[PDB]
């Protein structure tokens, strides 16, 4: 596996300001409504809004991404590991994560701390999709 | 340095035409593209709007008479029934505005009965 | 669909004064529009993006504001260099609905 590396971050700057869920530190968040697989994902938040890509959330976003879900669905996040280690985002560091299994899939859920590894990433879950604000 | 595009040879109407907005330095699968077009000194007119992969739209200024498309390489704009008002220079630029966007000199496309 | 409005046709100013041109809209935009400037025979340039915020290579000179649905834009001192038509743009980028953006009518300032 590797990342497919035609979509990367975005050098630009552009959220709408009607239909996003949620806000914070200069960015605009958007869970998405077809529920694709996890590989599949790079592309869906790279064909809903323009300078917007597949993310995976640091420490202080999570508590406020994860108080705007339900009890029981859950949601694709953006981290990976192209080698043997060092789970990053597309944004770059690095993070931790409740393993169990392997192969790069991970997802968060309401009662979630950190994020969380999945088993078979055939399953079909809503996506988390981010884009910065005017200021950059 | 910006988007270049060519192909404005003026022709006869019922016929189609091609338009082709190039790339240079950055990268073609990341922005999404648009097409604007502008009479002789007049208000320049929006044409549509399409991303990467395969989805578009379009004004109702036009019913289906454009397709726009998408390459990785280069998009690309077609026309079935141009026509006799249908005179213009087509316009390609990055959709978000900001410090990114960018805009290319232009190219004639002219009807000639 | 949506349309603009810019119902200052065709204004005159002194040399170093002050002009304003104003954009109207038919629904909300929530605050998202454009301004270009455009020399006879060249691309637009993009002075303003998101109502106010100044692309690279504007002086805080050119600045406009507003909200909701009605909007303006305030040139502070005009100068050799600023008679052009001035367009303004709205825009909207969804995936899921609809993507469209519409342009305006045209402003065509001159100085004395």
């Known amino acids: 596996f590797q990342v497919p590396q035609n979509y990367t971050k975005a050098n630009c700057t552009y959220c709408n300001t009607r239909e996003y869920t949620f806000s914070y530190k200069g960015c605009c968040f958007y869970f998405t409504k077809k529920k694709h697989t996890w590989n599949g994902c790079f592309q869906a938040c790279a064909e809903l809004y323009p300078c917007t890509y597949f993310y995976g959330p640091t420490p202080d976003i999570l508590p406020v991404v994860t108080r705007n879900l339900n009890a029981i669905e859950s949601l694709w996040v953006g981290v990976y590991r192209v080698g043997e280690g060092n789970w990053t985002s597309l944004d770059g560091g690095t993070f931790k994560v409740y393993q169990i299994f392997g192969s790069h899939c991970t997802y968060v859920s309401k009662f979630s701390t950190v994020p969380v590894s999945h088993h078979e990433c055939s399953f079909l879950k809503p996506c988390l999709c981010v884009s910065q604000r005017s200021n950059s | 340095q910006p988007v270049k595009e060519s192909g404005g040879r003026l022709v006869t109407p019922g016929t189609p035409l091609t338009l082709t907005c190039t790339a240079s330095?950055?990268?073609?699968?990341?922005?999404?593209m648009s097409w604007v077009r502008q009479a002789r000194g007049k208000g320049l007119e929006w044409i549509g709007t399409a991303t990467a992969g395969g989805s578009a739209w379009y004004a109702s200024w036009a019913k289906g008479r454009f397709t726009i498309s998408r390459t990785s390489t280069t998009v690309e704009l077609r026309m079935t029934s141009l026509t006799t008002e249908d005179t213009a220079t087509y316009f390609c630029?990055?959709?978000?505005?900001?410090?990114?966007?960018?805009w290319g000199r232009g190219t004639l496309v002219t009807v000639s009965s | 669909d949506l349309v603009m409005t810019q119902t200052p046709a065709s204004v005159e100013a002194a040399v170093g004064g002050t002009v304003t041109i104003k954009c109207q809209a038919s629904e909300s935009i929530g605050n998202a529009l454009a301004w270009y400037q455009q020399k006879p025979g060249q691309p637009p340039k993009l002075l303003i993006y998101?109502?106010?915020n100044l692309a690279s290579g504007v002086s805080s000179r050119f600045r406009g504001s507003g909200s909701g649905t009605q909007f303006t834009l305030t040139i502070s001192d005009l100068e050799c260099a600023d008679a052009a038509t001035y367009y303004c743009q709205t825009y909207y980028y969804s995936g899921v609905t609809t993507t469209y953006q519409a342009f305006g009518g045209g402003t065509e300032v001159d100085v004395k």
């Open positions: 330095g950055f990268s073609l699968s990341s922005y999404w």
């Open positions: 630029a990055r959709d978000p505005p900001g410090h990114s966007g960018l």
């Open positions: 998101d109502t106010s």
